[PDB]
Amino acid sequence: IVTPEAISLALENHEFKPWIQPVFCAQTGVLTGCEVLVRWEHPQTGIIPPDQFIPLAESSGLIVIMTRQLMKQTADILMPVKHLLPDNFHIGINVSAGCFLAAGFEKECLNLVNKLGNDKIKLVLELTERNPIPVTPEARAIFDSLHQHNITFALDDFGTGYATYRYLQAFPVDFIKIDKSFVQMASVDEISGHIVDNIVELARKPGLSIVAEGVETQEQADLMIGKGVHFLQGYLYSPPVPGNKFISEWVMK
Amino acid sequence: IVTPEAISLALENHEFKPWIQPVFCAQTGVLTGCEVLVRWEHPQTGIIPPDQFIPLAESSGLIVIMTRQLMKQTADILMPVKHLLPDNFHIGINVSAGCFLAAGFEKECLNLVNKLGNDKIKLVLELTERNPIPVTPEARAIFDSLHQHNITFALDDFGTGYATYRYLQAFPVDFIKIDKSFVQMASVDEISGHIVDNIVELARKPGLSIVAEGVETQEQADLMIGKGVHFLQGYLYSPPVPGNKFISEWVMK
Ligand SMILES: OC[C@H]1CC[C@H](O)CC1
Numbered sequence: 099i100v101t102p103e104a105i106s107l108a109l110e111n112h113e114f115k116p117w118i119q120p121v122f123c124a125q126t127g128v129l130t131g132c133e134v135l136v137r138w139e140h141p142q143t144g145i146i147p148p149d150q151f152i153p154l155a156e157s158s159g160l161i162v163i164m165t166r167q168l169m170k171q172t173a174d175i176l177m178p179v180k181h182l183l184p185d186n187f188h189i190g191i192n193v194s195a196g197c198f199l200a201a202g203f204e205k206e207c208l209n210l211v212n213k214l215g216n217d218k219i220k221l222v223l224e225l226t227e228r229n230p231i232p233v234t235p236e237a238r239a240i241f242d243s244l245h246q247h248n249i250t251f252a253l254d255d256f257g258t259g260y261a262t263y264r265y266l267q268a269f270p271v272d273f274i275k276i277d278k279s280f281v282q283m284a285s286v287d288e289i290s291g292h293i294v295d296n297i298v299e300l301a302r303k304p305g306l307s308i309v310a311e312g313v314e315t316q317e318q319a320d321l322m323i324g325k326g327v328h329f330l331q332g333y334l335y336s337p338p339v340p341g342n343k344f345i346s347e348w349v350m351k
Numbered sequence: 352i353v354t355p356e357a358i359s360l361a362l363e364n365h366e367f368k369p370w371i372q373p374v375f376c377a378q379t380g381v382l383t384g385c386e387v388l389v390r391w392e393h394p395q396t397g398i399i400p401p402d403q404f405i406p407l408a409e410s411s412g413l414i415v416i417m418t419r420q421l422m423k424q425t426a427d428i429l430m431p432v433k434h435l436l437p438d439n440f441h442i443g444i445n446v447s448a449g450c451f452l453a454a455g456f457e458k459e460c461l462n463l464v465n466k467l468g469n470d471k472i473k474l475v476l477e478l479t480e481r482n483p484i485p486v487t488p489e490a491r492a493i494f495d496s497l498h499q500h501n502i503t504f505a506l507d508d509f510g511t512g513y514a515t516y517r518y519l520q521a522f523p524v525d526f527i528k529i530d531k532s533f534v535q536m537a538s539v540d541e542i543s544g545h546i547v548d549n550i551v552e553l554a555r556k557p558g559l560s561i562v563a564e565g566v567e568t569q570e571q572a573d574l575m576i577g578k579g580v581h582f583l584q585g586y587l588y589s590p591p592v593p594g595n596k597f598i599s600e601w602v603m604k
Pocket residue numbers: 121122130131132133187188189190191222224252273309329
């Protein structure tokens with residue numbers, strides 16, 4: 099029984115942990131960044147997956163607290179090893195409208211960047227497709243302010259939900275992440291491949307970088323690489339893993 | 352002011368009228384079809400525009416009645432002149448998920464087509480961006496059934512709302528209508544033109560046709576024509592007009 103009070107208690111007890119999935123250069127296979135995903139480790143019941151708590155976190159507003167804690171915990175995890183990270187190491191944080199609009203959001207982003215090195219790392223706010231940022235002047239002001247501070251944006255799960263051409267028109271973002279439904283169907287159906295080409299063409303004029311999500315097989319990767327995708331992410335390389343294991347597997351060694 | 356009961360009463364009092372906007376071949380300027388739009392003429396106070404009633408029509412469910420009436424009235428309006436219509440004359444009807452999934456929908460579409468000539472006209476169900484059809488087997492069955500009956504589909508206001516690549520992947524539609532926000536901004540801003548190019552490239556592989564909406568100036572039209580758009584629609588040619596005036600201006604002369 100997942101309730102707002104159970105989520106609040108779990109936040110106090112720091113049960114929401116940052117699992118980290120590596121991301122790679124499509125050209126060379128080299129580690130270029132990561133995405134931070136949340137896992138609720140309930141001390142008795144075990145893993146409660148995002149599907150069961152994120153929606154309620156969002157409607158209750160608790161998501162703001164959760165995201166703040168994940169950002170803070172990500173800084174703590176990576177700080178001891180920040181000198182071992184490649185240059186321009188990307189850190190992907192999933193951001194909903196509620197977090198984006200919350201007083202003090204910009205400050206939390208700066209704290210993460212300052213702790214880890216203003217110029218060593220690149221913070222990528224991965225804007226969700228489900229609870230899009232509204233298209234308003236105020237939203238654009240926050241967006242522009244963060245950009246002036248060298249923080250960057252992705253449209254996440256592009257091609258699904260509210261992740262439309264309109265968002266690219268309203269917000270000059272830096273990355274587009276292709277939803278896995280297109281990546282994984284591009285070798286199977288008649289349009290999914292064409293959709294990936296379309297996203298590649300879309301990115302080219304403004305000079306955005308593309309990441310293919312959900313890369314599961316080598317043929318999917320080769321296909322994505324061949325179509326001009328810049329970064330790759332998925333279970334072929336690694337699923338998301340706990341922080342200590344992310345450090346141990348992908349940073350050390 | 353505007354309530355579900357006022358909408359119900361207005362339906363019974365026939366205050367919702369089908370206005371009709373012509374659509375044209377971009378290459379030649381020739382009449383190829385129309386879109387059926389709704390206007391609420393309140394007897395004392397005047398027009399209540401779609402923006403103020405459609406949402407409440409949709410959430411209340413009354414949209415199903417309204418759309419049914421509009422389809423029926425469009426048949427009545429065009430029947431006397433159907434022999435004067437060009438071959439393959441397109442009739443665009445705006446359809447939300449609620450209408451599409453309602454009992455009796457397919458039947459209403461057939462009645463329209465049979466009254467007007469199975470092979471003279473082409474019914475185009477313009478799927479809305481606000482209230483997308485769910486991506487389910489049952490939805491796809493209704494979609495396929497209608498296709499077998501030579502009824503066609505458009506993704507309306509493509510690039511906005513939920514009108515994403517995913518809808519093209521889930522439903523093999525026949526047309527894409529480009530939202531006016533791209534048509535009218537193409538050559539004011541830095542990406543809108545690029546977005547139209549992208550929609551043109553998107554359509555080409557599966558062989559879909561494109562209509563540019565909101566064509567307001569000659570330079571917008573020339574631009575859309577140059578980029579390979581197939582059909583044009585907007586105030587430059589004509590706003591929507593009452594049926595009798597549609598017939599008198601665009602059919603019977
Ligand atoms: O390392 C490439 C990065 C691109 C942006 C993404 O949001 C994170 C991974």
